Design a protein around this motif. Structure first.
Motif, PDB file in Angstrom:
ATOM      1  N   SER A 117       0.836  -1.172   0.000  1.00 32.88           N
ATOM      2  CA  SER A 117       0.000   0.000   0.000  1.00 32.88           C
ATOM      3  C   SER A 117       0.877   1.228   0.000  1.00 32.88           C
ATOM      4  O   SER A 117       0.652   2.061  -0.877  1.00 32.88           O
ATOM      5  N   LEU A 118       1.878   1.417   0.872  1.00 31.08           N
ATOM      6  CA  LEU A 118       2.776   2.567   0.773  1.00 31.08           C
ATOM      7  C   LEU A 118       3.300   2.691  -0.643  1.00 31.08           C
ATOM      8  O   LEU A 118       3.088   3.731  -1.281  1.00 31.08           O
ATOM      9  N   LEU A 119       3.880   1.585  -1.140  1.00 33.34           N
ATOM     10  CA  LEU A 119       4.491   1.553  -2.463  1.00 33.34           C
ATOM     11  C   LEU A 119       3.494   1.948  -3.553  1.00 33.34           C
ATOM     12  O   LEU A 119       3.848   2.748  -4.420  1.00 33.34           O
ATOM     13  N   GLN A 120       2.224   1.524  -3.492  1.00 32.40           N
ATOM     14  CA  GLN A 120       1.281   1.992  -4.484  1.00 32.40           C
ATOM     15  C   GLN A 120       0.948   3.448  -4.295  1.00 32.40           C
ATOM     16  O   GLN A 120       0.913   4.174  -5.295  1.00 32.40           O
ATOM     17  N   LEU A 121       0.816   3.953  -3.066  1.00 32.41           N
ATOM     18  CA  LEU A 121       0.561   5.372  -2.861  1.00 32.41           C
ATOM     19  C   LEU A 121       1.694   6.241  -3.451  1.00 32.41           C
ATOM     20  O   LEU A 121       1.442   7.268  -4.102  1.00 32.41           O
ATOM     21  N   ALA A 122       2.943   5.762  -3.313  1.00 36.67           N
ATOM     22  CA  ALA A 122       4.154   6.386  -3.843  1.00 36.67           C
ATOM     23  C   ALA A 122       4.119   6.514  -5.342  1.00 36.67           C
ATOM     24  O   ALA A 122       4.576   7.484  -5.941  1.00 36.67           O
TER      25      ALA A 122
ATOM     26  N   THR B 231       8.571   8.234  -2.303  1.00 39.28           N
ATOM     27  CA  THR B 231       8.266   7.382  -1.170  1.00 39.28           C
ATOM     28  C   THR B 231       8.265   8.130   0.159  1.00 39.28           C
ATOM     29  O   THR B 231       7.449   7.816   1.013  1.00 39.28           O
ATOM     30  N   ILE B 232       9.087   9.145   0.406  1.00 34.85           N
ATOM     31  CA  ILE B 232       9.001   9.918   1.637  1.00 34.85           C
ATOM     32  C   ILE B 232       7.653  10.615   1.653  1.00 34.85           C
ATOM     33  O   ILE B 232       6.986  10.650   2.689  1.00 34.85           O
ATOM     34  N   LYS B 233       7.208  11.082   0.481  1.00 33.62           N
ATOM     35  CA  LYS B 233       5.917  11.738   0.321  1.00 33.62           C
ATOM     36  C   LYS B 233       4.852  10.710   0.667  1.00 33.62           C
ATOM     37  O   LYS B 233       3.962  11.041   1.442  1.00 33.62           O
ATOM     38  N   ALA B 234       4.910   9.477   0.160  1.00 36.14           N
ATOM     39  CA  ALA B 234       3.956   8.434   0.490  1.00 36.14           C
ATOM     40  C   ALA B 234       3.910   8.242   1.976  1.00 36.14           C
ATOM     41  O   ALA B 234       2.809   8.264   2.507  1.00 36.14           O
ATOM     42  N   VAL B 235       5.050   8.128   2.669  1.00 40.28           N
ATOM     43  CA  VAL B 235       5.083   7.931   4.129  1.00 40.28           C
ATOM     44  C   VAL B 235       4.301   9.039   4.805  1.00 40.28           C
ATOM     45  O   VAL B 235       3.341   8.731   5.495  1.00 40.28           O
ATOM     46  N   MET B 236       4.623  10.299   4.513  1.00 41.34           N
ATOM     47  CA  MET B 236       3.947  11.468   5.063  1.00 41.34           C
ATOM     48  C   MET B 236       2.480  11.554   4.710  1.00 41.34           C
ATOM     49  O   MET B 236       1.690  11.811   5.617  1.00 41.34           O
ATOM     50  N   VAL B 237       2.047  11.343   3.468  1.00 45.87           N
ATOM     51  CA  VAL B 237       0.629  11.395   3.126  1.00 45.87           C
ATOM     52  C   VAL B 237      -0.121  10.268   3.850  1.00 45.87           C
ATOM     53  O   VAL B 237      -1.177  10.497   4.426  1.00 45.87           O
ATOM     54  N   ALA B 238       0.433   9.072   3.927  1.00 43.00           N
ATOM     55  CA  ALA B 238      -0.174   7.932   4.562  1.00 43.00           C
ATOM     56  C   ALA B 238      -0.416   8.187   6.042  1.00 43.00           C
ATOM     57  O   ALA B 238      -1.438   7.787   6.605  1.00 43.00           O
ATOM     58  N   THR B 239       0.481   8.885   6.714  1.00 40.88           N
ATOM     59  CA  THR B 239       0.409   8.985   8.153  1.00 40.88           C
ATOM     60  C   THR B 239      -0.098  10.304   8.662  1.00 40.88           C
ATOM     61  O   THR B 239      -0.461  10.400   9.856  1.00 40.88           O
TER      62      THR B 239
END
Lengths: 322, 322, 322
Positions: free
Chosen positions: B21-26, B311-319
């Motif tokens: 899921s992180l990887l797809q959001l990225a 991917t840092i953006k994915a981490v931040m948007v996810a959390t």
């Protein structure tokens, strides 16, 4: 030719019509901020500001300029080993262009700017190298317009006194060439720009209606000075007699001559270091400019400092926006 | 499980379905910036970036990522005495969580990140500790997807060659475990990742369709590599024979092997430091990667570098968002 | 009366009605950000934050506060030769005011803030000088209102224990004067604030309903304290007996006594500097505050830390908007 996605690495890579266009863009955006109806045209851009060597001023102009237009800035100051020490200019550039929309570089040789430009495929703006200082003279030429409204650069006399065998000298030369300015570098010979650039720049200067006249002679080189320009000397020896003081301002025979200085300036008998020198070398009232001229009706020094921002903004809007 | 307000301290705190899921959001967010229709989901957030030890790259990935999404960044660089010297981790965290919406930490042990996380009341992202480096491997696994579209991570073979008793080695292990990658650490034994983690990680790896194979033979371990990965050695003694050069690439028997490196990399015989390594211990053409492989049609190094941001953006948007 | 375009250099340049108005603005904006309907009133402003000496905390309060209101920040950290060394305060200020809409200064003597204020044509906020620390006490007086809702400052007792011959002591004095606080500086004689300011601010204090008492008696100074406030000592010699510990808290005869500390604080027997001190000088359980009081239900220390932001924001909204 379209400023879009061009770099800004030295003035002579542009035509006088391109220069004139930057200068007019700088003036619309100045009037627009001051009037309250600035159209932020960089509202999603991320700019990186690499400063290998400090500068309070260029950072501030690049940050305020970017921000007014909607861009966010990442300041990379003198702290990491500098580009070339642990990682290739070719790799630094290549990574940076993957993230940022434009890179400002201030540092060392023109080789580093020219190589960063070559590999980061984003525009690279030159905040000052050892060889050139183009954004400065943009602020300058704009300050000159404003204090002689209507006169074309073609019919303005600029005196740059003091040490010119440096990126300020080189930059005055590129300016004259693209402008047609009667530019006089008033300096001991040891303090005069290199032969080739002066050869090239005169030819262009003349060709545009000015000429580069190189004199050591104060009143003669200053004869009808429109503006007198200087900057820090350290030297105090050969440079001493070139101090812009009210006698120099008087020797223009010009009731309306104006004074410019890319700051910082040593005009006080106050500041830690300046004062040291006033003591040691006897230079009281100031070193390269006298405090009475710096705080004169004639110095347009802080409009010149403000104009640093309006022109860096012009460079960035011109090359990142359409 | 939904990442909202979770911390990001190591990869194994997440399930393979969360990782996927992180990887797809990225990858949605990558496509969306490239397509010009990124939905900024962090438009009021203020993120603090604590960097106890530098990193040109992580700062830039975190700043561009945050800014694209609307957040403002406060970079806190190696300058103040570091956390634990004059003020408690417990107090640093507690004050920071009063002001910022998320904290990135890059520095020393995993104890510091795990304690900041415990007391800050906001998500804490791990930019690299001595023990782990999760955001890196997010960029990496995303770079791997992109360069083998459709193939599931179960069926890609990763070789990480060189020193591995370190946060890069530990992170490859956590990656294999959540992924099912045939991961081969081709390192001298003095350099293998701490035993228990290999015990844990290999049983999870297998359980997901891969298996972790620890070896010293280059040939043996590289056998059918999909990707070959390395990073800086310094040591040059035991590590020398592990240099990724075109012979290593050839020993995969696979003409589409692609190369990865978390930069910086010593591949030139230019880079002042590297040049000394070239003279001093003779690694001409480069130290851990040869320049001919680094600048190979086979390297995906700068896509890997760009993916650090997505991917840092994915981490931040996810959390920070829903 | 309007704070509009006024500077903020010390508390006594304001009336108690202006102070009360800052403090109420600080509380509207706190409630508004917590209730999600903050009206960003600085949406085009560019603020410059000069920090001649570090502070993790003031930078963060000024950055989050400005950003929530729509302003962009240029942090100028201890890195350039400091103001007065190579360039005139008079020139630094004059150039800055051409670009930035407000300047925060944290550094050295009040002469530097007062001169920057004189020559920059924008408001200058005082983040801390050797002589004064006004923004701090804004956070403090706001933390006090909140923890005694309805009681007017007139009917509060503040103990500030420890060293006071310093900007914290001077600032408590200016606070009492504008407030009417029963303020007790419980310090050794060596550590009492300078006499003339105590003469002035006692007379103002009294005139508003409080009085400034200075004692060496912990028991007589503490007697009916509402809040007990301390800060770092280093000295351990004369200051030792002034440690805020639960005996001091008990000696107020007041069960509802609350504790404040501008952080950082040495309360652990963990942090490296606190441990040197714990063993070398036998202060286990903490130096100026004991850990059992710092982590007490009586410590309002982290609300005090959060309030730093809500009041710097009030200062900036008050002086840059209408």
């Amino acid at each position: 030719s379209g400023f879009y996605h061009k770099h800004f690495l030295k003035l002579l890579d542009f035509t006088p019509a391109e220069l004139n266009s930057l200068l007019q863009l700088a003036a619309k955006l100045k009037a627009d901020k001051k009037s309250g109806k600035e159209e932020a045209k960089l509202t999603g851009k991320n700019i990186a500001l690499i400063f290998e060597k400090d500068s309070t001023r260029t950072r501030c102009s690049f940050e305020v300029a970017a921000y007014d237009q909607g861009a966010r800035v990442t300041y990379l100051g003198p702290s990491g080993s500098q580009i070339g020490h642990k990682e290739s200019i070719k790799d630094t550039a290549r990574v940076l262009g993957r993230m940022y929309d434009g890179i400002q570089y201030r540092g060392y040789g023109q080789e580093i700017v020219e190589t960063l430009a070559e590999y980061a495929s984003v525009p690279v703006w030159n905040g000052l190298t050892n060889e050139f200082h183009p954004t400065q003279l943009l602020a300058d030429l704009l300050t000159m317009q404003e204090h002689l409204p209507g006169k074309a650069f073609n019919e303005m006399t600029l005196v740059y006194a003091g040490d010119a065998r440096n990126n300020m000298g080189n930059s005055m030369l590129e300016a004259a060439a693209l402008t047609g300015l009667d530019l006089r570098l008033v300096a001991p010979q040891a303090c005069w720009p290199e032969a080739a650039l002066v050869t090239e720049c005169r030819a262009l200067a003349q060709q545009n209606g000015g000429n580069i006249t190189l004199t050591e002679d104060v009143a003669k080189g200053v004869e009808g000075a429109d503006f007198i320009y200087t900057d820090v000397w350290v030297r105090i020896a050969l440079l001493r007699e070139y101090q812009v003081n009210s006698k120099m301002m008087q020797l223009t025979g010009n009731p309306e001559v104006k004074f410019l200085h890319c700051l910082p300036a040593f005009h006080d008998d106050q500041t830690t270091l300046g004062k040291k020198m006033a003591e040691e070398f006897g230079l009281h009232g100031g070193m390269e400019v006298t405090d009475e001229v710096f705080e004169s009706a004639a110095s347009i020094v802080f409009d010149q400092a403000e104009n640093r921002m309006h022109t860096i903004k012009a460079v960035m809007v011109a090359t990142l926006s359409k």
